[PDB]
Design a protein around this ligand. Structure first.
Ligand SMILES: Nc1nc2c(ncn2[C@@H]2O[C@H](COP(=O)(O)OP(=O)(O)NP(=O)(O)O)[C@@H](O)[C@H]2O)c(=O)[nH]1
Ligand SMILES: O=[N+]([O-])c1ccc(NNC(=S)Nc2ccc(F)cc2)c([N+](=O)[O-])c1
Ligand SMILES: [Mg+2]
Length: 166
C-alpha cells in the first residue's frame, strides 16, 4: 500500500468538495465538520496494486496561500475540477496549474482535468473548450457530476494513472 496525496483544486464553488466525498462515501455532502482539513483517505486497488488514496480538499476561498505551497510539495498529483456552467472556473484551472508547475518545478506534472456539473442545463464552457485546453497541456479530460454522480470515480481514478505513469 502506498500513500497517494491527491491535491484537489478547482476554484471554490465548482464542486470539488462534493466530487471528493463521492469517491469516499459516495454520498452528497449533507453533514460534515468544517473549520478543518476536509481530507479523506480511502484504500483501493488500481493498476493491480492496492494503495491508499489520501484525498486532500483545501479551501478554494479565504487567505491561506502558505497552506497551498505546502500541499503542492506534499501532494504527488493535482486534480483540476471546474464547472462547465461557470466560465470563471475554467479560468482558475489555468492559473492554478501555473502554481503546480512552479512548486513541482516542471511543466509536465501528474494531474487531471475534470469537468464537474455535467447534468446541469446551462453549460457555458462546452467540452470542446476544455478538451482543447487539456489536450494542449498533455493531460486527460474527464466529465463528472457531483449531483447526478456520473463517472465521479472515473475522474479521480485518472489521477492515480497519471502519477503511476509519471
Ligand atoms: N447542481 C449541482 N450542484 C452542485 C454541484 N456541485 C456542487 N453543487 C452545489 O452548488 C453549491 C456550491 O456551493 P459553494 O459554496 O460554491 O461550495 P462550498 O464552498 O463547498 N459550499 P458547499 O459545500 O455548500 O458547496 C452547493 O450547494 C454545492 O453542493 C454539481 O455538480 N451540480
Ligand atoms: O505554510 N504553512 O502556513 C504551513 C505549512 C505546513 C504546516 N504544517 N505542516 C503540514 S505537513 N501540514 C499539512 C501537511 C499535509 C496535509 F495534508 C495537510 C497539512 C502548517 N501548519 O500550521 O501545521 C502551516
Ligand atoms: Mg462543499
Amino acid at each position: 500500500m502506498t500513500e497517494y496525496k491527491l491535491v484537489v483544486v478547482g476554484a471554490g464553488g465548482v464542486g470539488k468538495s462534493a466530487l471528493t466525498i463521492q469517491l469516499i462515501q459516495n454520498h452528497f455532502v449533507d453533514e460534515y465538520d468544517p473549520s478543518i482539513e476536509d481530507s479523506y483517505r480511502k484504500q483501493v486497488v488500481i493498476d493491480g496494486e492496492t494503495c491508499l488514496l489520501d484525498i486532500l480538499d483545501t479551501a478554494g476561498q479565504e487567505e491561506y496561500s502558505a497552506m497551498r505551497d505546502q500541499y503542492m510539495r506534499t501532494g504527488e498529483g493535482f486534480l483540476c475540477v471546474f464547472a462547465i456552467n461557470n466560465t470563471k472556473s475554467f479560468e482558475d484551472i489555468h492559473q492554478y496549474r501555473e502554481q503546480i508547475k512552479r512548486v513541482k518545478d516542471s511543466d509536465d506534472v501528474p494531474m487531471v482535468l475534470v469537468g464537474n456539473k455535467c447534468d446541469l442545463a446551462a453549460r457555458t464552457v462546452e467540452s470542446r473548450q476544455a478538451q482543447d485546453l487539456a489536450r494542449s497541456y498533455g493531460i486527460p479530460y474527464i466529465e463528472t457530476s457531483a449531483k447526478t454522480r456520473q463517472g465521479v470515480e472515473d475522474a479521480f481514478y485518472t489521477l492515480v494513472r497519471e502519477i503511476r505513469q509519471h
